[PDB]
Amino acid sequence: EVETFAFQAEIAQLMSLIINTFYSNKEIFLRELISNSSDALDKIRYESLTDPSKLDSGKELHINLIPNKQDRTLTIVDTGIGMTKADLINNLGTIAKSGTKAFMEALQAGADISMIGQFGVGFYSAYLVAEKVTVITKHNDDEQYAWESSAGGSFTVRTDTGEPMGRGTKVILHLKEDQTEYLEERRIKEIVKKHSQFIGYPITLFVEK
C-alpha cells in the first residue's frame, strides 16, 4: 500500500535548482546529511536526560556510512530520534517552505549551494549526487516507514516491511552514474575529515568485501 504525494511547489523548485544548476562542489551533500544525523542524535539524547526509557529502542548513539558498489548506494545510518509519518510527509521534519524562500534569495545575492544547510533544507542536497533517495525511519511514537523520491515533483510513503531499525533514520542514496567516487573509501574519508571533524558522535565508515 503506497501513498503518492506531490511536493509543495517551492520544494519542487528547490530540488530542480539543486539538480539543474551547474555546481562542481557536490561533496557537501555528505556534510549536510551527517549534520542532520547529528541534530537527530542530539534530540533523542536531550529527551533521554529526563526519561531514560526513550533509549529502550537503542542505547547507542552513532552514525554509520555504508557504501555498496554492487547496488551503487551510499547509506547514512543514524540512531537519532527518527521521524513520524507526519514528519516525513511534512518535508522530513523541516520548515522547507520558508527555508527554500530564504535560500533562493541568498543565492541571487551572492550565496552558493554549499550554504544550503544554513537554511534548514540541507537534506535536499542529496540530489547533487543521487538520482533517487530512500529514507527509512523509526520514531519511538510511530511505526517504521519508507519515504522515496526520484524528484520529478512527487514522493511516496509506505510502511516498511524491511529490516527493523529500532530507532533512527537511514538515508539511502542511489547515486548517479558519474558520482561513484562517493563509494570509494579514501574519498569518503577525505570528506569526513574535511567537513565533519567536530561531529560529537562516532562516524564509522564500513568497508566492502
Ligand X SMILES: c1cnc(-c2cn[nH]c2)cn1
| Cβ-based nearer residue to ligand X, 174 or 186 | 174
* Piece of the chain touching ligand X by CB under 6 A; list 47-55, 64-72, 76-84, 153-161: 76-84
For the sheet containing 154-159, what is the strand order? 3-6, 154-159, 145-149, 130-138, 168-175, 73-78, 63-68, 203-205
Q: Give the nearest distance from C-beta 72 to ligand X in angstroms.
A: 20
Q: Which of 14, 40, 88, 192 binds ligand X (CB under 6 A)?
A: 40
| Cβ-based nearer residue to ligand X, 42 or 131 | 42
User: Rule CB under 6 A: is residue 36 a binding residue for ligand X?
Assistant: yes
Q: Which of 30, 33, 74, 157 binds ligand X (CB under 6 A)?
A: 33
Provide the residue count of the chain: 209
Contacts of 39 (CB under 8 A, 6+ apart): 80
User: Rule CB under 6 A: is residue 80 a binding residue for ligand X?
Assistant: yes
* Cβ neighbourhood burial of 51 (10 Å; 0-12, 13-18, 19+): exposed
Instruction: Give the annotated binding-site residues for ATP.
Output: 36, 78, 97, 123
Instruction: Give the annotated binding-site residues.
Output: 36, 78, 97, 123
Give the interface with ligand X as residue ranges (CB under 6 A): 33, 36-37, 40, 80-83, 92-93, 123, 169, 171
